Scaffold this motif. Structure first.
Motif, PDB file in Angstrom:
ATOM      1  N   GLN A 290       0.806  -1.200   0.000  1.00  0.00           N
ATOM      2  CA  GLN A 290       0.000   0.000   0.000  1.00  0.00           C
ATOM      3  C   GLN A 290       0.855   1.274   0.000  1.00  0.00           C
ATOM      4  O   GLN A 290       0.472   2.295  -0.589  1.00  0.00           O
ATOM      5  N   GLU A 291       1.998   1.229   0.690  1.00  0.00           N
ATOM      6  CA  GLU A 291       2.880   2.392   0.747  1.00  0.00           C
ATOM      7  C   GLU A 291       3.409   2.729  -0.644  1.00  0.00           C
ATOM      8  O   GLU A 291       3.507   3.911  -1.009  1.00  0.00           O
ATOM      9  N   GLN A 292       3.811   1.716  -1.405  1.00  0.00           N
ATOM     10  CA  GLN A 292       4.247   1.912  -2.796  1.00  0.00           C
ATOM     11  C   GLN A 292       3.120   2.425  -3.708  1.00  0.00           C
ATOM     12  O   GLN A 292       3.358   3.268  -4.577  1.00  0.00           O
ATOM     13  N   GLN A 293       1.912   1.869  -3.526  1.00  0.00           N
ATOM     14  CA  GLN A 293       0.769   2.322  -4.323  1.00  0.00           C
ATOM     15  C   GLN A 293       0.508   3.822  -4.092  1.00  0.00           C
ATOM     16  O   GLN A 293       0.251   4.566  -5.042  1.00  0.00           O
ATOM     17  N   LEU A 294       0.587   4.272  -2.832  1.00  0.00           N
ATOM     18  CA  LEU A 294       0.422   5.714  -2.546  1.00  0.00           C
ATOM     19  C   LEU A 294       1.546   6.521  -3.183  1.00  0.00           C
ATOM     20  O   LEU A 294       1.325   7.652  -3.702  1.00  0.00           O
ATOM     21  N   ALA A 295       2.793   6.042  -3.088  1.00  0.00           N
ATOM     22  CA  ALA A 295       3.900   6.762  -3.704  1.00  0.00           C
ATOM     23  C   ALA A 295       3.682   6.896  -5.204  1.00  0.00           C
ATOM     24  O   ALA A 295       3.978   7.965  -5.752  1.00  0.00           O
ATOM     25  N   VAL A 296       3.203   5.865  -5.894  1.00  0.00           N
ATOM     26  CA  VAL A 296       2.961   5.978  -7.341  1.00  0.00           C
ATOM     27  C   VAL A 296       1.829   6.996  -7.612  1.00  0.00           C
ATOM     28  O   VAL A 296       1.955   7.836  -8.531  1.00  0.00           O
ATOM     29  N   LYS A 297       0.771   6.986  -6.807  1.00  0.00           N
ATOM     30  CA  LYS A 297      -0.294   7.968  -6.991  1.00  0.00           C
ATOM     31  C   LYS A 297       0.250   9.409  -6.867  1.00  0.00           C
ATOM     32  O   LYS A 297      -0.121  10.303  -7.635  1.00  0.00           O
ATOM     33  N   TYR A 298       1.094   9.640  -5.830  1.00  0.00           N
ATOM     34  CA  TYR A 298       1.715  10.925  -5.617  1.00  0.00           C
ATOM     35  C   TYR A 298       2.610  11.338  -6.792  1.00  0.00           C
ATOM     36  O   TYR A 298       2.485  12.448  -7.302  1.00  0.00           O
ATOM     37  N   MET A 299       3.521  10.462  -7.209  1.00  0.00           N
ATOM     38  CA  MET A 299       4.397  10.771  -8.319  1.00  0.00           C
ATOM     39  C   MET A 299       3.625  11.008  -9.619  1.00  0.00           C
ATOM     40  O   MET A 299       4.062  11.869 -10.400  1.00  0.00           O
ATOM     41  N   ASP A 300       2.571  10.252  -9.861  1.00  0.00           N
ATOM     42  CA  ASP A 300       1.765  10.489 -11.088  1.00  0.00           C
ATOM     43  C   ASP A 300       1.151  11.900 -10.985  1.00  0.00           C
ATOM     44  O   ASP A 300       1.194  12.676 -11.965  1.00  0.00           O
ATOM     45  N   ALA A 301       0.607  12.265  -9.820  1.00  0.00           N
ATOM     46  CA  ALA A 301       0.046  13.631  -9.691  1.00  0.00           C
ATOM     47  C   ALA A 301       1.110  14.709  -9.926  1.00  0.00           C
ATOM     48  O   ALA A 301       0.833  15.710 -10.579  1.00  0.00           O
ATOM     49  N   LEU A 302       2.300  14.520  -9.349  1.00  0.00           N
ATOM     50  CA  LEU A 302       3.375  15.472  -9.475  1.00  0.00           C
ATOM     51  C   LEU A 302       3.797  15.639 -10.928  1.00  0.00           C
ATOM     52  O   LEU A 302       3.877  16.768 -11.413  1.00  0.00           O
ATOM     53  N   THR A 303       4.053  14.528 -11.615  1.00  0.00           N
ATOM     54  CA  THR A 303       4.588  14.570 -12.960  1.00  0.00           C
ATOM     55  C   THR A 303       3.547  15.000 -13.969  1.00  0.00           C
ATOM     56  O   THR A 303       3.905  15.431 -15.067  1.00  0.00           O
ATOM     57  N   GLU A 304       2.271  14.855 -13.661  1.00  0.00           N
ATOM     58  CA  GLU A 304       1.204  15.357 -14.532  1.00  0.00           C
ATOM     59  C   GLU A 304       0.820  16.795 -14.237  1.00  0.00           C
ATOM     60  O   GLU A 304       0.009  17.373 -14.948  1.00  0.00           O
ATOM     61  N   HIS A 305       1.349  17.311 -13.109  1.00  0.00           N
ATOM     62  CA  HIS A 305       0.903  18.630 -12.593  1.00  0.00           C
ATOM     63  C   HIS A 305      -0.554  18.625 -12.260  1.00  0.00           C
ATOM     64  O   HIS A 305      -1.271  19.582 -12.517  1.00  0.00           O
ATOM     65  N   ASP A 306      -1.074  17.506 -11.772  1.00  0.00           N
ATOM     66  CA  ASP A 306      -2.440  17.402 -11.262  1.00  0.00           C
ATOM     67  C   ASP A 306      -2.450  17.940  -9.839  1.00  0.00           C
ATOM     68  O   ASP A 306      -2.420  17.169  -8.866  1.00  0.00           O
ATOM     69  N   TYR A 307      -2.468  19.256  -9.711  1.00  0.00           N
ATOM     70  CA  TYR A 307      -2.293  19.908  -8.417  1.00  0.00           C
ATOM     71  C   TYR A 307      -3.466  19.676  -7.467  1.00  0.00           C
ATOM     72  O   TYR A 307      -3.251  19.629  -6.250  1.00  0.00           O
ATOM     73  N   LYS A 308      -4.669  19.476  -7.996  1.00  0.00           N
ATOM     74  CA  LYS A 308      -5.789  19.151  -7.108  1.00  0.00           C
ATOM     75  C   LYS A 308      -5.574  17.833  -6.375  1.00  0.00           C
ATOM     76  O   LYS A 308      -5.886  17.730  -5.186  1.00  0.00           O
ATOM     77  N   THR A 309      -5.023  16.834  -7.040  1.00  0.00           N
ATOM     78  CA  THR A 309      -4.680  15.570  -6.376  1.00  0.00           C
ATOM     79  C   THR A 309      -3.415  15.790  -5.531  1.00  0.00           C
ATOM     80  O   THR A 309      -3.303  15.326  -4.395  1.00  0.00           O
ATOM     81  N   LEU A 310      -2.418  16.507  -6.084  1.00  0.00           N
ATOM     82  CA  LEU A 310      -1.158  16.585  -5.397  1.00  0.00           C
ATOM     83  C   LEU A 310      -1.323  17.221  -4.009  1.00  0.00           C
ATOM     84  O   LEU A 310      -0.683  16.788  -3.074  1.00  0.00           O
ATOM     85  N   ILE A 311      -2.080  18.304  -3.934  1.00  0.00           N
ATOM     86  CA  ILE A 311      -2.205  19.076  -2.694  1.00  0.00           C
ATOM     87  C   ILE A 311      -2.807  18.221  -1.569  1.00  0.00           C
ATOM     88  O   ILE A 311      -2.552  18.492  -0.396  1.00  0.00           O
ATOM     89  N   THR A 312      -3.545  17.158  -1.903  1.00  0.00           N
ATOM     90  CA  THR A 312      -4.078  16.243  -0.894  1.00  0.00           C
ATOM     91  C   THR A 312      -2.959  15.545  -0.106  1.00  0.00           C
ATOM     92  O   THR A 312      -3.184  15.069   1.002  1.00  0.00           O
ATOM     93  N   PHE A 313      -1.756  15.494  -0.668  1.00  0.00           N
ATOM     94  CA  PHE A 313      -0.622  14.853  -0.026  1.00  0.00           C
ATOM     95  C   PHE A 313       0.173  15.792   0.867  1.00  0.00           C
ATOM     96  O   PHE A 313       1.118  15.349   1.506  1.00  0.00           O
ATOM     97  N   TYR A 314      -0.172  17.070   0.896  1.00  0.00           N
ATOM     98  CA  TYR A 314       0.633  18.040   1.605  1.00  0.00           C
ATOM     99  C   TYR A 314      -0.160  18.766   2.686  1.00  0.00           C
ATOM    100  O   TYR A 314      -1.358  19.010   2.562  1.00  0.00           O
ATOM    101  N   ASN A 315       0.556  19.121   3.753  1.00  0.00           N
ATOM    102  CA  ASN A 315       0.130  20.225   4.627  1.00  0.00           C
ATOM    103  C   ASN A 315       1.278  21.249   4.715  1.00  0.00           C
ATOM    104  O   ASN A 315       2.270  21.139   3.989  1.00  0.00           O
ATOM    105  N   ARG A 316       1.151  22.269   5.566  1.00  0.00           N
ATOM    106  CA  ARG A 316       2.159  23.313   5.552  1.00  0.00           C
ATOM    107  C   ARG A 316       3.509  22.859   6.076  1.00  0.00           C
ATOM    108  O   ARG A 316       4.496  23.580   5.931  1.00  0.00           O
TER     109      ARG A 316
END
Lengths: 154, 137
Positions: B4-30
């Motif tokens: 599951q940890e790897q699956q989340l990392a791939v979801k994050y990297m796909d958002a980052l590399t696509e510039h899908d910022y709506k998905t990406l921001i779900t992975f971040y806080n300040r």
């Protein structure tokens, strides 16, 4: 085309005239480590040096504590190899991507009275103090699950 | 089969590399840290990470992180691979051109599996190889 692969000690490449000095020093350190040459290895540490296996979440601070941990961990372990796929550096931070190859008595690997042979993917980085010929931080990222998969067959 | 940890990392990297910022921001806080340890460049918090990506990748044509080997130890995911970037050269020292580089790298992610966040993203990028490629362009 027809090609062959030649296995070369990195020490034989270090003086080509193309390898940055920071990488050349990393080679000396890694050869000492993988040969269990603790007399040489401790010259690269002081009381502030850090050895951090981030995968294992084990951070040792201080050369004396690092050396004791290494010596104990490697009781009975024969020389091992770090077979690198790529090495690069950003200043004094040296990054090495490769596989650690261990062959020999399996006691430390949970296989007492057997001979084991494993090749473990890893990234190792060294932050160097070039003036003092010191490793200030050694970070390991070891693929333990791959190691475990191989040991399951031995 | 993928942890599951790897699956989340791939979801994050796909958002980052696509510039899908709506998905990406779900992975971040300040407090989420992006550290390119090789560049000695740090950005902390979603707003500032995304601002960096917008600047770094302005006008991008193609961007991918091609994973050669990935593994995890608990919530620490390690990815060895190569970043492919094709885009305007201005900031890479090549004005008026589109540059195309394929950069060896290791990216590690420390995940908060409760909150589904990236707490620390550390990049170790081979910029000397990037420079060698740019010299031919």
């Amino acid at each position: 085309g027809m090609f062959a692969s030649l296995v070369i000690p990195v020490s034989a490449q270090a003086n080509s005239g193309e390898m940055p000095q920071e990488q050349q020093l990393a080679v000396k350190y890694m050869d000492a480590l993988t040969e269990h040459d603790y007399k040489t290895l401790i010259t690269f540490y002081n009381r502030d040096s850090i050895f951090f296996d981030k995968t294992a979440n084990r951070k040792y601070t201080g050369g004396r504590f690092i050396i004791d941990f290494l010596e104990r961990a490697h009781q009975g372990v024969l020389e091992y190899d770090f077979n690198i796929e790529h090495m690069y550096n950003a200043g004094s931070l040296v990054v090495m991507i490769g596989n650690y190859h261990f062959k020999g008595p399996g006691e430390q690997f949970g296989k007492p009275g057997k001979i084991i042979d494993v090749a473990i993917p890893a990234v190792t980085s060294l932050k160097l103090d070039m003036l003092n010929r010191r490793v200030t931080e050694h970070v390991d990222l070891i693929d333990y699950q791959t190691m475990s998969d191989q040991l399951a067959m031995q």
